[PDB]
Design an enzyme around this catalytic site. Structure first.
Site, PDB file in Angstrom:
ATOM      1  N   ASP A  32      -3.438  -6.217 -18.310  1.00 22.43           N
ATOM      2  CA  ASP A  32      -3.446  -4.986 -17.593  1.00 22.43           C
ATOM      3  C   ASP A  32      -4.570  -4.088 -18.078  1.00 22.43           C
ATOM      4  O   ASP A  32      -4.815  -3.998 -19.286  1.00 22.43           O
ATOM      5  CB  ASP A  32      -2.088  -4.301 -17.759  1.00 22.43           C
ATOM      6  CG  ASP A  32      -1.893  -3.157 -16.800  1.00 22.43           C
ATOM      7  OD1 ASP A  32      -2.467  -2.061 -16.954  1.00 22.43           O
ATOM      8  OD2 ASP A  32      -1.063  -3.309 -15.937  1.00 22.43           O
ATOM      9  N   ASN A  88       8.208  -2.964 -10.446  1.00 27.79           N
ATOM     10  CA  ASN A  88       8.365  -1.668  -9.819  1.00 27.79           C
ATOM     11  C   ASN A  88       8.401  -1.784  -8.309  1.00 27.79           C
ATOM     12  O   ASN A  88       7.544  -2.478  -7.735  1.00 27.79           O
ATOM     13  CB  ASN A  88       7.204  -0.764 -10.226  1.00 27.79           C
ATOM     14  CG  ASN A  88       7.196  -0.436 -11.727  1.00 27.79           C
ATOM     15  OD1 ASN A  88       8.203  -0.518 -12.396  1.00 27.79           O
ATOM     16  ND2 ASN A  88       6.056  -0.099 -12.250  1.00 27.79           N
ATOM     17  N   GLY A  94       7.675   3.569  -9.301  1.00 29.75           N
ATOM     18  CA  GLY A  94       6.342   3.735  -9.839  1.00 29.75           C
ATOM     19  C   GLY A  94       5.342   2.698  -9.365  1.00 29.75           C
ATOM     20  O   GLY A  94       4.336   2.518 -10.008  1.00 29.75           O
ATOM     21  N   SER A  96       2.246   1.480  -7.488  1.00 30.92           N
ATOM     22  CA  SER A  96       0.922   1.972  -7.080  1.00 30.92           C
ATOM     23  C   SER A  96       0.007   1.016  -6.341  1.00 30.92           C
ATOM     24  O   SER A  96      -0.923   1.421  -5.689  1.00 30.92           O
ATOM     25  CB  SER A  96       0.161   2.403  -8.297  1.00 30.92           C
ATOM     26  OG  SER A  96      -0.074   1.365  -9.175  1.00 30.92           O
ATOM     27  N   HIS A 101       3.921  -7.494  -8.473  1.00 27.36           N
ATOM     28  CA  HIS A 101       3.384  -7.776  -9.799  1.00 27.36           C
ATOM     29  C   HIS A 101       4.488  -7.616 -10.825  1.00 27.36           C
ATOM     30  O   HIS A 101       5.177  -6.581 -10.839  1.00 27.36           O
ATOM     31  CB  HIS A 101       2.125  -6.945 -10.112  1.00 27.36           C
ATOM     32  CG  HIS A 101       2.227  -5.494  -9.898  1.00 27.36           C
ATOM     33  ND1 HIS A 101       2.246  -4.957  -8.625  1.00 27.36           N
ATOM     34  CD2 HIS A 101       2.185  -4.413 -10.738  1.00 27.36           C
ATOM     35  CE1 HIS A 101       2.249  -3.608  -8.713  1.00 27.36           C
ATOM     36  NE2 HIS A 101       2.206  -3.267  -9.977  1.00 27.36           N
ATOM     37  N   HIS A 103       5.123  -6.991 -14.714  1.00 24.89           N
ATOM     38  CA  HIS A 103       4.594  -6.551 -16.004  1.00 24.89           C
ATOM     39  C   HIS A 103       5.333  -7.299 -17.115  1.00 24.89           C
ATOM     40  O   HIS A 103       6.557  -7.439 -17.056  1.00 24.89           O
ATOM     41  CB  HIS A 103       4.850  -5.071 -16.220  1.00 24.89           C
ATOM     42  CG  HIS A 103       4.190  -4.139 -15.280  1.00 24.89           C
ATOM     43  ND1 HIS A 103       3.024  -3.481 -15.588  1.00 24.89           N
ATOM     44  CD2 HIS A 103       4.605  -3.750 -14.033  1.00 24.89           C
ATOM     45  CE1 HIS A 103       2.739  -2.721 -14.536  1.00 24.89           C
ATOM     46  NE2 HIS A 103       3.670  -2.857 -13.585  1.00 24.89           N
TER      47      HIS A 103
HETATM   48  N1  LIG Z   1      -8.597  -4.186 -11.953  1.00 26.43           N
HETATM   49  C1  LIG Z   1      -7.436  -4.269 -12.601  1.00 26.43           C
HETATM   50  N2  LIG Z   1      -7.202  -5.184 -13.582  1.00 26.43           N
HETATM   51  C2  LIG Z   1      -6.082  -5.223 -14.325  1.00 26.43           C
HETATM   52  N3  LIG Z   1      -4.990  -4.390 -14.159  1.00 26.43           N
HETATM   53  C3  LIG Z   1      -5.156  -3.449 -13.187  1.00 26.43           C
HETATM   54  C4  LIG Z   1      -6.354  -3.292 -12.361  1.00 26.43           C
HETATM   55  N4  LIG Z   1      -6.097  -2.261 -11.524  1.00 26.43           N
HETATM   56  C5  LIG Z   1      -4.945  -1.744 -11.771  1.00 26.43           C
HETATM   57  N5  LIG Z   1      -4.346  -2.476 -12.764  1.00 26.43           N
HETATM   58  C6  LIG Z   1      -2.967  -2.308 -13.307  1.00 26.43           C
HETATM   59  O1  LIG Z   1      -2.133  -2.587 -12.236  1.00 26.43           O
HETATM   60  C7  LIG Z   1      -0.847  -2.096 -12.538  1.00 26.43           C
HETATM   61  C8  LIG Z   1      -0.170  -1.776 -11.240  1.00 26.43           C
HETATM   62  O2  LIG Z   1       1.217  -1.578 -11.515  1.00 26.43           O
HETATM   63  C9  LIG Z   1      -1.124  -0.948 -13.521  1.00 26.43           C
HETATM   64  O3  LIG Z   1      -0.362  -1.136 -14.774  1.00 26.43           O
HETATM   65  C10 LIG Z   1      -2.649  -0.877 -13.652  1.00 26.43           C
HETATM   66  O4  LIG Z   1      -3.121  -0.416 -14.872  1.00 26.43           O
END
Ligand SMILES: Nc1ncnc2c1ncn2[C@@H]1O[C@H](CO)[C@@H](O)[C@H]1O
Ligand SMILES: Nc1ncnc2c1ncn2[C@@H]1O[C@H](CO)[C@@H](O)[C@H]1O
Ligand code: NA
Ligand code: NA
Lengths: 115, 115
Positions: A32, A88, A94, A96, A101, A103
């Site tokens: 991440d 999420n 949360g 976005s 995905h 985590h």
């Molecule tokens: N280009 C990227 N590479 C890796 N993680 C990413 C990128 N863009 C967003 N994220 C991660 O994607 C997650 C979306 O929940 C976030 O924790 C964010 O930091």
């Protein structure tokens, strides 16, 4: 097209790199960009599913594959003391980026509540 | 025997009740006794898997079934604005009961980091 329209579609198509730690034909795992723990990675399906509330019954095996990959990647990264997996959904969750995905966070004690 | 040796084995065998909101032949969902959000429930497999790090490849469909059940239960409970799903592994994950369990939390904004 394959991989969908989001940030994560671009990662799946390799148009923009990510720090990939696992790839098989169903999914990708990568670190991440905004880590919240010493180890913090994502596992994403290559199939575009926008959010867990949009997954279908036939996606069960794929969803479970994301957690099995997350377990494997966590062990490859040395997470012997454990980890937390998080998905999420929507605004209150949360979420976005509208591509599913998972985590995986570890390398520190995770607290409670989980946000 | 079926359901295993933990608190959750007793719940699966119905020896002790829980506030059950979904049951099919693979799993059970019930409200958490120590809720951390206005809605906070658990989805557990009826098969005893001690922790996500002990799940096997053949358990993928079952693991994904837990998230599909969690999505259904969340919608039945009115979680229109979203929710967070959490699986804890081991000490750093905050796992206290060694039977896999998926938390589903909603009815408020979930924060970040997720613990
Ligand atoms: N280009 C990227 N590479 C890796 N993680 C990413 C990128 N863009 C967003 N994220 C991660 O994607 C997650 C979306 O929940 C976030 O924790 C964010 O930091
Ligand atoms: N008898 C029970 N019924 C419902 N939830 C429980 C019970 N015992 C423990 N829990 C919940 O199990 C979870 C284990 O991660 C905790 O969130 C805890 O509050
Ligand atoms: Na591994
Ligand atoms: Na439903």
């Amino acid at each position: 097209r394959p991989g969908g329209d989001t940030i994560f579609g671009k990662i799946i198509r390799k148009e923009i790199p990510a720090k990939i730690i696992f790839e098989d034909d169903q999914c990708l795992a990568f670190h991440d960009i905004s880590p919240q723990a010493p180890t913090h990675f994502l596992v994403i399906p290559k199939k575009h599913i926008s959010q867990i509330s949009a997954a279908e019954d036939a996606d069960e095996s794929l969803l479970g594959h994301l957690m099995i990959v997350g377990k494997k990647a966590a062990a490859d990264l040395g997470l012997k003391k454990g980890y937390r997996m998080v998905v999420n959904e929507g605004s209150d969750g949360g979420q976005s980026v509208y591509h599913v995905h998972l985590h995986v966070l570890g390398g520190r004690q995770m607290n409670w509540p989980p946000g």
